[PDB]
Design an enzyme around this catalytic site. Structure first.
Site, PDB file in Angstrom:
ATOM      1  N   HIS A  22     -16.105  -6.655  39.441  1.00 11.08           N
ATOM      2  CA  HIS A  22     -17.121  -6.900  40.460  1.00 11.08           C
ATOM      3  C   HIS A  22     -16.808  -6.173  41.768  1.00 11.08           C
ATOM      4  CE1 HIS A  22     -19.627 -10.229  38.678  1.00 11.08           C
ATOM      5  NE2 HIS A  22     -18.603 -10.224  37.843  1.00 11.08           N
ATOM      6  N   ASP A  62     -22.208 -10.245  46.502  1.00 11.23           N
ATOM      7  CA  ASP A  62     -22.339 -10.370  45.059  1.00 11.23           C
ATOM      8  C   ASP A  62     -23.088 -11.671  44.813  1.00 11.23           C
ATOM      9  OD1 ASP A  62     -20.363  -9.451  42.308  1.00 11.23           O
ATOM     10  OD2 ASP A  62     -21.698 -11.190  42.275  1.00 11.23           O
TER      11      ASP A  62
HETATM   12  C1  LIG Z   1     -14.150 -10.058  36.218  1.00 15.41           C
HETATM   13  O1  LIG Z   1     -14.087 -11.472  36.399  1.00 15.41           O
HETATM   14  C2  LIG Z   1     -14.750 -12.299  35.529  1.00 15.41           C
HETATM   15  C3  LIG Z   1     -16.131 -12.206  35.369  1.00 15.41           C
HETATM   16  C4  LIG Z   1     -16.825 -13.035  34.485  1.00 15.41           C
HETATM   17  C5  LIG Z   1     -18.304 -12.965  34.291  1.00 15.41           C
HETATM   18  O2  LIG Z   1     -18.872 -13.993  33.583  1.00 15.41           O
HETATM   19  C6  LIG Z   1     -20.218 -14.020  33.355  1.00 15.41           C
HETATM   20  C7  LIG Z   1     -20.788 -15.063  32.641  1.00 15.41           C
HETATM   21  C8  LIG Z   1     -22.159 -15.105  32.399  1.00 15.41           C
HETATM   22  O3  LIG Z   1     -22.673 -16.147  31.689  1.00 15.41           O
HETATM   23  C9  LIG Z   1     -23.021 -14.110  32.861  1.00 15.41           C
HETATM   24  C10 LIG Z   1     -22.547 -13.024  33.589  1.00 15.41           C
HETATM   25  O4  LIG Z   1     -23.407 -12.065  34.030  1.00 15.41           O
HETATM   26  C11 LIG Z   1     -21.090 -12.938  33.868  1.00 15.41           C
HETATM   27  C12 LIG Z   1     -20.539 -11.887  34.587  1.00 15.41           C
HETATM   28  C13 LIG Z   1     -19.167 -11.862  34.820  1.00 15.41           C
HETATM   29  O5  LIG Z   1     -18.650 -10.819  35.527  1.00 15.41           O
HETATM   30  C14 LIG Z   1     -16.153 -13.997  33.738  1.00 15.41           C
HETATM   31  C15 LIG Z   1     -14.779 -14.167  33.829  1.00 15.41           C
HETATM   32  O6  LIG Z   1     -14.154 -15.115  33.078  1.00 15.41           O
HETATM   33  C16 LIG Z   1     -14.001 -13.308  34.747  1.00 15.41           C
HETATM   34  O7  LIG Z   1     -12.651 -13.450  34.861  1.00 15.41           O
END
Ligand SMILES: COc1cc(-c2[o+]c3cc(O)cc(O)c3cc2O)cc(O)c1O
Length: 446
Positions: free
Chosen positions: A17, A114
């Site tokens: 992100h 974000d």
């Molecule tokens: C990069 O960091 C993370 C991002 C995400 C993440 O989860 C999502 C879950 C959703 O249901 C939908 C999303 O669009 C996500 C995007 C993410 O970056 C999840 C993690 O466990 C992470 O550690």
């Protein structure tokens, strides 16, 4: 009259992100070098972005709490750290504002955040400044958050392959493609999932929503649908600013190796960095790559080298590279690469479709299933791996389909078509060119 414009930036302070938001701020800071941009992250997120880099002087970095009290040891699940930071609330954010205001001697006139940092909307409303949401995720998944009740109702009563026809332009989406965290209710409900399920209410309060994707790649009816739900829906091209990319050495020797292979013949494998797949799949992926006979670059965890089949890396060394790291964007932009085996991360998908590389899909969680469906059933630029999980026989059949078989000619043709669409979209008369300037004016008149 002196310029009093001051944009506060609140990234989701984690991994994937971070680059896409700094990338946007860099472009903004370049075209508006009189406006002050205050990037407010955590110590770990700032150490991640700004350690090596050099940034334009109108961008300033400030530090707030990660939500992890000293002495505490977070568990080995990718959700806890997100939850802990989100639990800091708007007060931790306002502390970052204080640091910005004190340094620039300018009050904040606009906020870019974000979409997951929903507490920054609270900050924006207190300051009486416009709130701009940044969406670095799978773009098509925005529509889900305005129909959570319907989605939940259908995912429980109907079959798992039932289509979500109530989603304009996204009728191809199925029940089994829905992110698990918007179905989880009760104990399994996290602060992170509660935050994501608030988007359908949070997002419309944004002055603009900036999608880090190509507007011409989304279903026109989806785009129109989202424009009905938001005050403003803007697209800005996710391709890197010259200030973003860091000059890095090809230590593993991936590129020079790729030059020794013929066109569209190599399989590039990388199933993410956030979630580690079950060891049995890792074995299956290795077994399939060996049985197939195809040349391959596999970007794999150093810690997963021990579960690999015995002698595998050594028997495949004359036609395969198993490495800890790859310059992925450079690897995907290489002509030798014929297929991308991916977990369907938003950034990985972006990099593959913009380079005309077709994908074998194995989504693990989040919006990765939404990405996978679009890749296979909508853009038709790849396939979900047979059985939705990696198997030796199923993955080989996917490799054969894409790389060599005539049955995969439609997909390879579509991969090239989409690339041309991207190349035209990032043009001077694409949508984002008009949209990028709309964003600058919002910030100008803030
Ligand atoms: C990069 O960091 C993370 C991002 C995400 C993440 O989860 C999502 C879950 C959703 O249901 C939908 C999303 O669009 C996500 C995007 C993410 O970056 C999840 C993690 O466990 C992470 O550690």
């Amino acid at each position: 009259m002196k310029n009093k414009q001051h944009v506060a930036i609140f990234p989701f302070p984690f991994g994937s992100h971070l680059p896409p938001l700094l990338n946007l701020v860099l472009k903004l800071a370049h075209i508006a070098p009189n406006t002050s941009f205050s990037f407010i992250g955590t110590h770990s997120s700032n150490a991640f972005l700004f350690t090596k880099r050099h940034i334009p002087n109108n961008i300033r970095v400030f530090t707030i709490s990660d939500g992890i009290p000293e002495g505490h040891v977070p568990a080995n699940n990718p959700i806890e750290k997100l939850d802990l930071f989100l639990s800091t609330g708007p007060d931790n954010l306002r502390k970052g504002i204080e640091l910005a205001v004190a340094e620039t001697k300018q009050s904040v006139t606009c906020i870019i955040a974000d979409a997951f940092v929903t507490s920054s909307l609270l900050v924006a409303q207190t300051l009486n400044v416009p709130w701009i949401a940044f969406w670095p995720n799978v773009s098509c998944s925005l529509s889900l958050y305005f129909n959570i009740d319907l989605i939940r109702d259908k995912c429980s009563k109907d079959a798992k392959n039932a289509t979500l026809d109530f989603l304009p332009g996204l009728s191809k989406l199925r029940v089994e493609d829905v992110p698990q965290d918007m179905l989880d209710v009760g104990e399994k409900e996290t602060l992170f999932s509660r935050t994501l399920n608030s988007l359908g209410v949070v997002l419309p309060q944004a002055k603009a929503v900036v999608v880090n994707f190509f507007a011409e790649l989304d279903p026109p009816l989806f785009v129109k649908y989202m424009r009905s739900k938001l005050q403003s829906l803007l697209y800005v091209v996710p391709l890197p600013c010259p200030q973003l990319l860091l000059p890095e050495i090809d230590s593993n020797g991936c590129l020079s190796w790729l030059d020794s292979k013929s066109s569209r013949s190599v399989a590039y494998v990388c199933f993410g960095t956030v979630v580690s797949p079950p060891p049995q799949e890792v074995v299956a992926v290795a077994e399939a790559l060996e049985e197939s006979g195809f040349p391959f670059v596999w970007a794999l965890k150093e810690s997963l080298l021990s579960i690999l089949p015995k002698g595998f890396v050594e028997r495949t060394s004359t036609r395969g590279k198993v490495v800890s790291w790859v310059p992925q964007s450079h690897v995907l932009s290489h002509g030798s690469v014929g297929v991308f085996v991916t977990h369907c991360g938003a950034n990985s998908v972006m990099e593959s479709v913009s380079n005309g590389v077709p994908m074998i899909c194995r989504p693990f969680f989040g919006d990765q299933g939404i990405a996978a469906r679009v890749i296979q059933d909508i853009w038709e630029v790849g396939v979900i791996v047979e059985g939705k999980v990696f198997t030796k026989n199923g993955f080989v059949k996917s490799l054969n389909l894409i790389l060599v078989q005539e049955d995969g000619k439609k997909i390879r043709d579509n991969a090239l078509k989409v690339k041309q669409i991207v190349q035209d979209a990032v043009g001077p008369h694409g949508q984002a060119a008009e949209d990028f300037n709309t964003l600058v004016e919002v910030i100008s008149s803030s």
